[PDB]
Write the structure tokens for this entry.
Amino acid sequence: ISASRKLQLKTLMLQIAKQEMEREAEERRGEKGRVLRTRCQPLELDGLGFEELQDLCRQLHARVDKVDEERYDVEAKVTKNITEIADLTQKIYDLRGKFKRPTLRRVRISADAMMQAL
Amino acid sequence: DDIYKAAVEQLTEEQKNEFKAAFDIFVLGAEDGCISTKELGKVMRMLGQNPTPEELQEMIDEVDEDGSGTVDFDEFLVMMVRCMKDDSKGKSEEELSDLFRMFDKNADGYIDLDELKMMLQATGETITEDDIEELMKDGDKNNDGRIDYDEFLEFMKGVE
Amino acid sequence: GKRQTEREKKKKILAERRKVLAIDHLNEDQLREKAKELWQSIYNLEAEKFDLQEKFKQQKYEINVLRNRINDNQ
Amino acid sequence: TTALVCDNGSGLVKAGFAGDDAPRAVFPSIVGRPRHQGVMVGMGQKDSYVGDEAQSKRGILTLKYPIEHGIITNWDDMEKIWHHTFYNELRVAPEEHPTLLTEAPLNPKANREKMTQIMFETFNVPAMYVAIQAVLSLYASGRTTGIVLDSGDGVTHNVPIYEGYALPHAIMRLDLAGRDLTDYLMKILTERGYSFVTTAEREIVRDIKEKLCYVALDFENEMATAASSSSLEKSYELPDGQVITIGNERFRCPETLFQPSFIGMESAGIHETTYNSIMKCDIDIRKDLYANNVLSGGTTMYPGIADRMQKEITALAPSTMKIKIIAPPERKYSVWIGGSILASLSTFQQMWISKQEYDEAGPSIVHRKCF
Amino acid sequence: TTALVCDNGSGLVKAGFAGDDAPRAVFPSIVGRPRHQGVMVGMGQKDSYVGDEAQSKRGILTLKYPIEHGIITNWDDMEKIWHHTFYNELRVAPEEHPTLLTEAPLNPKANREKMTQIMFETFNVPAMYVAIQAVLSLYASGRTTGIVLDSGDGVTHNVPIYEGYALPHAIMRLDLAGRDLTDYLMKILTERGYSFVTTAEREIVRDIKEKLCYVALDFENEMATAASSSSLEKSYELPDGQVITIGNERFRCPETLFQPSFIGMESAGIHETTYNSIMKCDIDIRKDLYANNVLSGGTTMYPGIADRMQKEITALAPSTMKIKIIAPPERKYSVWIGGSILASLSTFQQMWISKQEYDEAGPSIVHRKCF
Ligand SMILES: Nc1ncnc2c1ncn2[C@@H]1O[C@H](COP(=O)(O)OP(=O)(O)O)[C@@H](O)[C@H]1O
Ligand SMILES: Nc1ncnc2c1ncn2[C@@H]1O[C@H](COP(=O)(O)OP(=O)(O)O)[C@@H](O)[C@H]1O
Ligand SMILES: [Mg+2]
Ligand SMILES: [Mg+2]
């Protein structure tokens, strides 16, 4: 049974996972930008009458309201999720502490110090 | 490898003098300067803290890769400071969680033999048939046929 | 208790969320400028909402992970 | 700061700072006034030698334990013992350290209240907490269930615990312990000619019991073997010569634990009070208690007790259940190790009886929520 | 999206997504607070273990079912059970899934209205629908006629249906069910010496009933045989050993179904309330109901009931009609399978009680057209 080679494999897979996470985040950013360009259409309104200005403005206001509504919904969702994450993280930490802290101590800190003092 | 050469390079003569004082009993004379690892068992016990005998043999056989059976003072230095804690902080817990999430690309919350197999195959590293089963024991700590969060965390415990 | 409490809360949030809406009654150039500004505002809103979706997805995966771990205790 | 994990016990006081592996100072709890007249002038003769000092001058003292059976019968001597423990064996003033005493189950209330009143008025500690001696021994084993038999030197008690929920109706406290075994050994040694009477010679008989006695796996076979051969007779050298030879007194002294009829006690042995304590528990946690029987306390250090007890319980218990007896090598200090672990916990840090709370409710605070 | 087919039941909560074959998570519906004191600190002890977790720690809990006879008597506990079912056994937030509860016939209105109010206010589902537990069991059999006897654990009800037209004047609901059989078995076991009293030991008696009891084809002959030979005495090992031997208690416990005078109930057995339910129907659909008698529910899983019931009905019914008793092997989950089938239908997709409708008419919407 080799252990140093296992350590090499561990560190190398750690590096590979780091690189994969980097490239995956990069792809995520690219897809986010692409989808953002896809969904929010750009509009050009040069040399237009004021009536078209009113129409575009009102549509934009309605879209603003809708987007803020969706942001409110997803924000409530995220707040609830974060609350659950904090609670469950605390619970799992308590479980781990129960399992492990009974095994933490300072062994032989001064026991070996008693040689010939008596 | 020479990674721990750099690791031991951090400590200057301040610990070198103490190490030479400890090693002077190792060089007790009547020797041709070979300096084997015979006393190393108690040399690592010079201050009391001594690791597993298996780790002691791993350190012994690991260094002196030429097989000369000669203990370089640099080799003894790095092996005795290896008794001292030496780690690169083992990444980050959030970072490790992201790493396991990437590992759990199946989003199942578990990694089987195939998941880890593909994970390391993507690295391209040669892995023996004598391995894999070793990795099976290392990962499947619960003997449940999968790799869990605690099992992964122990598997990646402070490794960098 | 979410029968009027949550509904009125979000209604108030939307009401305060809306800012002034008095624009097209001005000269064309600045109106066009501000309309472009508000398009960019909506664009950033959509980008941030997508970011919120992705963060919510990741946090839901993490909540699945925490549920899985707490189930792994048994 | 660090907490002081004291453990009064009865026979050996064990103390030390929280978070270590072993108690810092372990010494007998005896206070012995001199009894003769004394003719040398200026020798610097004190009026009472306590602790380990009175185990070296015991030739001219009258040692008397201040704790009879868990309860404390002589409060002045106990105060003297505590003062010695704090100032000379640890050398830490109590004004800057929380304390965690230990107490046997089912003890009189007045004992506990007086203990807390002393700790708060005389020594003036910042905060003290009293814990049952068996829960700590369960901490030290790293378990969370199990029925622990803590056979100390004063009193033997048997507290069953499941999933952290103690069962108060199933505690079986029996007053046979190491001291009664010492007295019975001193009483059966007279059958060969050796008479120990003085309170100082009780210590010699205790040393004989510790070094020679063992628990027989089967009593009748050992009684028959010791009566025919002579392979058991082990000799021992008194503090002045004149070696003595102990025959079948070796396994007859600790046999009293499993047959308390020897010293005239009515109750059943420690092999049957554990089974009775289990049977009082609910029907669904009996398997776990059977599998996690824990031994602790000094008197459970006899060579060969973890097999005799398992054989007896297996005889009593149903044939299907597995009987396992946990006997860690660090049995003697198990209670104190558990006390250190408990005092080192972060969750426990707000359970101490703070001094302002005592000032508001008096010594009767200990029976209240802060248990 | 997919619909959540929950089925509260009384004794086992069965849930799962619509369109599958079997419920995803099946677990007892019990909520048990701990009853002892608890001495270990930081053990992470919760205040109420629900579902299948409280069937493993039942040694130190006091389990109490939140549903007595179909009706719900303790709304807080039922809310806790639902919350557990949604979040931990299925892990799907209810904000994005329709729900299809089930309810026994002839239940109090307030129960149903409170159920819908909870589902719409606390869990905030998009739309929920309440269905009678017998129509689903008729769905699962793939029939469209037939009289279904759904002998659950809370209440036994007998709904006849023809060509899809339910007959509301012929529903015979009887409150004898599995729980009363458990209590009667626990009461007749005392005739041999075995006493089960604690609410935790009721689970052990339930296991005995499930694994050993069977319905006798002829009662008097079995009573005579069990009193002479000993070929019936089957033994069973308690959770701690001490095997027990059940004699003629085997077929006397489930015989209460056909003679409710055993537990003091006046009414007639399940063999005669079916015939009475048929005879209340019109004279021209009695042949079809005779030929398509359906069994469902857990308690109809006793070995040998599909023959005893057929013999009894053949004795009661006219000699010309053919009596057939449909007893599918998937009896226990028949109601839930039918619920999945009903929720998967396209024609049913517009019968849900949409949330805006509830906002306009209040909880009393359930009694209205959306039944
Ligand atoms: N190695 C041993 N073998 C046999 N008996 C022992 C041994 N060590 C201690 N004892 C007995 O146990 C007693 C000490 O018990 P201890 O656990 O210190 O009591 P306490 O619970 O009061 O601390 C002594 O009086 C002695 O009789
Ligand atoms: N295999 C079986 N044999 C005999 N009785 C059973 C069996 N399985 C379940 N039961 C009885 O049926 C009950 C479960 O009935 P169930 O159909 O789950 O009720 P519900 O209609 O509330 O879901 C249990 O309490 C048990 O007493
Ligand atoms: Mg003790
Ligand atoms: Mg049912």
